[PDB]
Amino acid sequence: MSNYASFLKENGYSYIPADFYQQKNTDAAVRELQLTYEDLKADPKGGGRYRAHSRYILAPQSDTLELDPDNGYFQSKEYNYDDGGIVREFDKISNEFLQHPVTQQMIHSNVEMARQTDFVDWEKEVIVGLHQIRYHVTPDAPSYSSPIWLHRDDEPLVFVHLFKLSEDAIGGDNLIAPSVKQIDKVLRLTDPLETLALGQKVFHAVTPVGTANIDGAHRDILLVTFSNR
C-alpha cells in the first residue's frame, strides 16, 4: 500500500492493480455493484454520461464517515473548464452501492493511502466524494469526460476505479501529462477494480469512449475524491 502512496506522492499519480482491491472480494460481489450502473440517470450537461454523487465527511480525529445529506456538486471553472463555475444537481448514489462491503472496503483503502499523503489537511474536515459514472455510447453518439480533455480537478486526490468495460468499447484510455503539450503516460483500465490515483501535480484525461456495435457499449467507473472544506 505505502508503495503506491509513495509513487503517488512523487509522480502525482499511481496505477493500482485490481489485486489490491479484489484480493478480498468474489467476482459475484463485484458484479452486483456493476448492475447498479444500469439505473443511473443522465448527467444534465450530457456527454452520454449517467451519474450519481454522494459525499461523506471525515471529522478530524474520526474514522466515522458521515453521509452528507446535501448533494450539489461544484468545481471551479479554473479546473473544470467545461461544466465548472456552476453547481450541478446529480442523483444520490444508491444505498445498495454505498453500503456494499466492496465499496466500503475500497473507500477505507483509499482513505488509508490518502492519509499517507499531504494532499489534504487531515487536521480539518475531509470530504470523501464519490462519483458513480457510466459513460454510455452508441455509434451515433459517443461519451466523454467533464472536462473533455487534459485537466486537473479541484479535488487534490482522485481515485479512478473501473467497474466495467464492454468488449466492443473504444477509448477510455487514461492519459497522464506534465503539460498540455506533452503526454508521459497512456494507460487503459480494462478489468474490474483496476485503479488510477491522481494528484493535482499532473494533468490527466480520459480519451472519449465510443463503440463499433449498434447495440451500444459502456464504461462504468467509480471516482473517490478527497478534499478539504
Ligand X SMILES: CC[C@H](C)[C@H](N)C(=O)O
Indicate which of ligand X, a second copy, none lies near residue 70 (CB less than 5 to 8 Å, by partner kind): a second copy
Indicate which of a second copy, ligand X, none lies near residue 225 (CB less than 5 to 8 Å, by partner kind): ligand X
Indicate which of a second copy, ligand X, none lies near residue 85 (CB less than 5 to 8 Å, by partner kind): a second copy
- What is the residue-wise DSSP string for 121-183? -TTS-EEEEEEEEEEEEBTTB-B--SSSSSB--SSSEEEEEEEEE-TTEE--EEEEESSSS--
Interface positions with ligand X (CB under 6 A): 75, 80, 83, 131, 145-146, 153, 155, 158, 160, 174, 204, 206, 221, 223, 225
Dig out the grid coordinates for 34 from the structure: 456493476
Indicate which of a second copy, ligand X, none lies near residue 125 (CB less than 5 to 8 Å, by partner kind): a second copy
> For residue 33, what is the enclosing H or E element?
helix 27-36
Write down the least CB distance from residue 154 to ligand X, Å. 7
Residue 98 near residue 105, CB atoms below 8 Å: no
Residue placing its CB nearer to ligand X in the complex, 26 or 141: 141
Dig out the grid coordinates for 7 from the structure: 509513487
Indicate which of ligand X, a second copy, none lies near residue 32 (CB less than 5 to 8 Å, by partner kind): a second copy
Residue 225 near residue 54, CB atoms below 8 Å: no
Write down the least CB distance from residue 180 to a second copy, Å. 4
Interface positions with a second copy (CB under 8 A): 31-32, 35-36, 38-39, 57, 59, 64-72, 74, 76-79, 81, 84-87, 89, 91-92, 94-96, 99, 124-125, 149-150, 180, 229
Write down the least CB distance from residue 145 to ligand X, Å. 4
Q: Per residue, what are the HEC states of 79-133?
A: CCCCCCCCEECCCCCCHHHHHCHHHHHHHHHHHHHHHCCCCCCCCCCEEEEEEEE
Is residue 8 helix, strand or coil?
A: helix
Residue placing its CB nearer to a second copy in the complex, 11 or 71: 71
